[PDB]
């Protein structure tokens, strides 16, 4: 009834109105245990962004490579082992440096997903409806990418073909 995604079920109590992308999709009632939807939305958006970047990297590594030889592997899962540990540890340290401040931030803030990242100011001057539309676009694209990046990983692990 109240779920748009599952037009027959009634959504849970915490799925209503605000927090764009709310289509009443919580059949298992996971939202009933979390105190609020702030942390789960932060986790969902982090997954969405990481999955978008992962899909883009998957395709680009399929087609484009860095000039060096160590980056010449086309299969992303094989490149996970072919690439030297120095590059991967540098990436991990960069991510952890970004992650510790946001670790302090996420567990207490009202909008843990709002990291203040807008270098090009794509949101300055946008109205509330436009901002909500942008949030919906981001969430949609992220969910589709998550499904897609998991599918790419599965098909590479099951057939060895990294794409198509």
């Amino acid at each position: 009834a109240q779920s748009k995604a599952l037009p027959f079920l009634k959504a849970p109590a915490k799925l209503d109105g605000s927090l764009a992308g709310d289509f009443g999709f919580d059949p298992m009632g996971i939202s009933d245990q979390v105190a609020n939807l702030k942390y789960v939305r932060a986790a969902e958006l982090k997954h969405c962004r990481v999955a978008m970047l992962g899909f883009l990297g998957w395709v680009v590594q399929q087609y484009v490579h860095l000039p060096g030889e160590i980056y010449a592997e086309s299969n992303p899962l094989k490149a996970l082992t072919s690439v030297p540990l120095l590059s991967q540890i540098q990436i991990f340290l960069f991510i952890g440096a970004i992650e510790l401040a946001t670790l302090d931030q996420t567990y207490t803030a009202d909008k843990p997903w709002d990291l203040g990242f807008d270098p090009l100011n794509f949101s300055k001057g946008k109205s509330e409806q436009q901002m909500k539309d942008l949030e919906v676009k981001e969430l949609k694209n992220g969910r589709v990418a998550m499904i897609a990046i998991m599918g790419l990983i599965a098909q590479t692990l099951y057939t060895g073909v990294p794409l198509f």
């Binding site: 009834a1 599952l6 037009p7 027959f8 079920l9 009634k10 059949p27 298992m28």
Partner: protein
């Protein structure tokens, strides 16, 4: 008192439902289970049997967009579980049924979901209540006929080897 069985009395739990309540429950199963759960099970069986009867009949006549699909809908099960199609259909069916547990559990508990209702009318074939009730009765009658017909089809196609007459 019953409309279907004049001898036996009308079932206590069957008074009126647009699902085709003709008071046919000689064994009193409606006393055992909630009527809503039995209605959901009946509608699920109806839809599965209709799809299966149409698929069996069609796949014996024109079904070969490839090589592994050159079977006679009797050896099709093993061939296509070896191929892997039945695995995918089972995965999606399991997802749908796992969602259906909550749908069955949201009814029998409150809400307003009628048995067998999934709000799936993309083409809007039903417009008002009268059309909805008429076509619910039609769907359930067709589903019961399809249950019996598929039972006959499998029993005959296993008692012999033949085509559409079976």
């Amino acid at each position: 008192k019953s409309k279907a069985v004049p001898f036996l009395p009308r079932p206590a739990a069957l008074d009126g439902s647009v699902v085709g309540d003709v008071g046919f429950d000689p064994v009193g199963f409606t006393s055992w289970l909630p009527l809503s759960y039995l209605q959901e099970a009946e509608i699920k069986h109806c839809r599965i049997a209709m799809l299966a009867t149409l698929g069996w009949i069609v796949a014996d006549f024109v079904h070969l967009p490839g090589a592994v699909h050159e079977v006679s809908s009797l050896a099709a099960h093993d061939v296509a579980v070896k191929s892997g199609a039945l695995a995918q259909i089972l995965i999606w069916t399991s997802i749908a049924e796992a969602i259906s547990v909550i749908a069955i559990s949201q009814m029998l508990e409150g809400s307003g979901r009628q048995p067998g209702d999934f709000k799936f009318d993309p083409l809007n074939f039903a417009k008002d209540e009268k059309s909805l009730k008429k076509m619910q009765l039609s769907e359930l009658k067709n589903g019961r006929l399809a249950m019996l017909a598929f039972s006959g089809i499998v029993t005959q196609a296993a008692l012999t080897g033949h085509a559409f007459p079976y």
